[PDB]
């Protein structure tokens, strides 16, 4: 399927144990997509002070359209030293590996895959 319904655990930035997906734009997008498929991907909501506490390159989920079955349609955009790879809508948050941190909420998304 071109889209997959996912429920992403929303993590507090200070709980996150693995603060990024790797070392290059291509690696972080690759790893983010693998962790989304494997159900091992968390979401951190972006506010003042969050991104400097995570590792670049960043992987964002961005709204791709204006929401089937309660799932917002999203796509991946990476960022490294202020340049983004991809073009999309409003940021829903930054993706990180999930390694058992307790979430504060879930974010239902329809991931363009």
C-alpha to C-alpha distance for 18 and 16, rounded to whole angstroms: 6
Q: Counting every residue, how long is the chain? A: 113
Residue 73 CB burial class (10 angstroms; 0-12, 13-18, ≥19): middle
C-alpha to C-alpha distance for 83 and 69, rounded to whole angstroms: 33
3-class DSSP state of 48: coil
Establish whether the linkage from the previous residue to 57 is cis, with ω within 30° of 0: yes
C-alpha to C-alpha distance for 90 and 51, rounded to whole angstroms: 16
Q: What is the CA radius of gyration of the chain?
A: 13
Of 1, 81, 9, 72, the C-alpha closest to 39 is 9
Strands 72-80 and 105-112, bridge-based pairing:
parallel
For the domain spanning 3-112, the CATH number is: 2.30.30
C-alpha to C-alpha distance for 69 and 87, rounded to whole angstroms: 25
């Amino acid at each position: 399927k071109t889209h997959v319904q996912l429920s992403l655990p929303v993590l507090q930035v200070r709980d996150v144990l693995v603060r990024g997906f790797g070392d290059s734009v291509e690696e972080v997008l690759s790893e983010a997509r693998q962790h989304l498929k494997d159900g091992t991907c968390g979401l951190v909501e972006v506010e003042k002070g969050v991104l400097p506490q995570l590792e670049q390159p960043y992987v964002f989920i961005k709204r791709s359209d204006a929401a089937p079955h309660g799932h917002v349609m999203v796509e991946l955009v990476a960022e490294l030293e202020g340049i983004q790879y991809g073009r999309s809508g409003e940021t829903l948050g930054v993706l990180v590996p999930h390694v058992g941190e307790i979430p504060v909420a879930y974010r239902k998304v329809l991931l363009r895959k």
